[PDB]
Amino acid sequence: VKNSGYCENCRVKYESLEQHIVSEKHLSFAENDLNFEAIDSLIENLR
């Protein structure tokens, strides 16, 4: 559980990576495709 640091996505500091990624706010951010929009241009711009 040594992994600890900031998260620019959730704007919250976590003491554990395996519990931040399964937290409520992080899952809500990941499931929302509107946040990952400009990258969506690149996935198929190259392909």
């Binding site: 992994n3 600890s4 640091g5 900031y6 998260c7 620019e8 704007r11």
Partner: protein, 140 residues
């Protein structure tokens, strides 16, 4: 002290370091980087701390590490000797510039001069405000 500020006084001072005289004692560790040189690739400011490169116990390490590390450096030397561009490498074999400063090999030969059978976290951070309240400073 060290004090870096804005002459326009428009921004808050960037550097405000104020050390008491007793903190200036114990020259082994200053609160600021006094230039040190060091050896064996050390960061100049970092010294040889708890490290005596003159200790034979250390010496049998660095020369021997140099023995296994010898021919990797020989290959690199022969590959980067004559031309900076490496596309004209293939062509007496090795040339060297003479020196007189003592060495790891010379040190180890000296230690056999002197000891052997003879005498002598994540990477990001939250965006914090710059102005600290008086109560928060008092709580410190």
């Amino acid at each position: 002290h060290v004090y870096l500020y804005d002459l326009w006084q428009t921004w808050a001072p960037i550097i405000t370091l104020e050390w008491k005289p007793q903190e200036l004692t114990n020259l082994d560790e200053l609160p600021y980087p006094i230039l040190k040189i060091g050896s064996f690739g050390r960061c100049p400011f970092i010294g040889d701390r708890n490290y005596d490169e003159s200790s034979y116990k250390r010496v049998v390490k660095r020369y021997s590490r140099d023995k296994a590390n010898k021919k990797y450096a020989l290959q690199l030397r022969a590959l980067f000797q004559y031309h900076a561009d490496t596309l004209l490498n293939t062509s007496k074999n090795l040339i060297f510039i003479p020196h007189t400063c003592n060495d790891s090999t010379k040190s180890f030969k000296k230690w056999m001069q002197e000891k052997a059978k003879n005498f002598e976290g994540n990477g990001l951070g939250p965006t914090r405000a710059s102005v600290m309240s008086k109560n928060m400073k008092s709580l410190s």
